[PDB]
Amino acid sequence: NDVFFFRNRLGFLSGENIILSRTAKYFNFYPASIANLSDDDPIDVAVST
């Protein structure tokens, strides 16, 4: 529905989901590696209410 940039993360608003990109890599919406939860991982939080 919308395209924005918050904290240097290219973000989208799809349905009830707010999707943010990596801190610097705007074109990488996937995490780095499943070994230890990283800091600049993408945020794909969903509003629950």
Binding site: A24, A32, A35, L37, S38, D39
Partner: protein, 64 residues
Amino acid sequence: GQNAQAKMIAAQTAAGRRQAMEIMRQTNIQNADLSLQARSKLEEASAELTSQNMQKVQAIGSIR
């Protein structure tokens, strides 16, 4: 008893030859154990270096 002396000395050839063969068996077996220990050390080094890698993922991630 020349035959008795020959038999006794033949036992010495037997004693030295089996003693030497055993020296090689013990020395060769110990070396294999040391090689296996070196391999285990390599595996431990790999594991600790992987731990160092995983810590790096989170560390450089925070910097970025």
